[PDB]
């Protein structure tokens, strides 16, 4: 509660002082972990905002390219949506050891299975081909973008856990060690005093005996 409740002793002083040094060292090392996570978090934040901005422009261009494909082809969306079987793009999970914390990152995997070739409506193949490329690039950006968000909220959780532990060391564990140590120091001086009293009285009693002998 308020004290570790170790009986006052010189041994307790040594243990408590070593315990305090350990707690202070842990506090400083965890504070550095938090600072490293906070810098990385903010960096991820800078890239994610700029990436989010870029995503806007890239998706706009892809959406426009679709308009051109539709202009030429007419209604290709019906065939594309219905005639779906296997993917050409797949995402493999990878681990990135950014710091003590390990974060999940996505990695783009070009599986290789061929996409559908469609020249059925007005044979608008070139516009569909440019459209494939524009969205293909869009997906690659988005994959990167998820590795931002998927590696980001995990940093916010890691920071909250680290800071909570650091705060407890600072607000709970060390104050408690310092109160215990100060308690020990005071009680040991109290024991020193009662020894002083008895020794002083012993010296006076010896003096009285000596006077009686004269």
């Amino acid at each position: 509660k308020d004290r570790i409740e170790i009986f006052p002793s010189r041994m307790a002083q040594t243990i408590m002082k070593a315990r305090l040094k350990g707690a202070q060292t842990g506090r400083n090392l965890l504070k550095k972990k938090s600072d490293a996570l906070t810098l990385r978090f903010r960096q991820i934040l800078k890239k994610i905002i700029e990436t989010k901005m870029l995503m806007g422009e890239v998706m706009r261009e892809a959406a426009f390219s679709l308009a051109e494909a539709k202009f030429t082809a007419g209604d290709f969306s019906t065939t594309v949506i219905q005639n779906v079987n296997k993917a050409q793009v797949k995402i493999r999970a990878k681990k990135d050891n950014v710091a003590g914390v390990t974060l999940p990152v996505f990695e783009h995997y070009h599986e290789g299975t061929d996409s559908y070739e469609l020249t059925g409506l007005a044979r608008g193949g070139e516009q569909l081909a440019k459209l494939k490329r524009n969205y293909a690039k869009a997906v690659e950006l988005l994959v990167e973008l998820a590795s931002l968000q998927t590696s980001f909220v995990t940093l916010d959780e890691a920071i909250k856990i680290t800071n909570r532990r650091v705060n407890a060391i600072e607000h709970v564990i060390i104050p408690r060690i310092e109160r215990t140590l100060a308690y020990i120091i005071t009680e040991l001086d109290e024991r020193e005093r009662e020894e002083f009293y008895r020794l002083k009285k012993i010296q006076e009693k010896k003096k009285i005996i000596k006077e009686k002998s004269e």
């Binding site: 060292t25 842990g26 090392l29 965890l30 972990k33 050891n97 710091a99 003590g100 914390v101 390990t102």
Partner: peptide
């Protein structure tokens, strides 16, 4: 001293 804290992460 550090391994007990960070678990050999780095």
């Amino acid at each position: 001293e550090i391994v007990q804290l960070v678990g050999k992460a780095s």
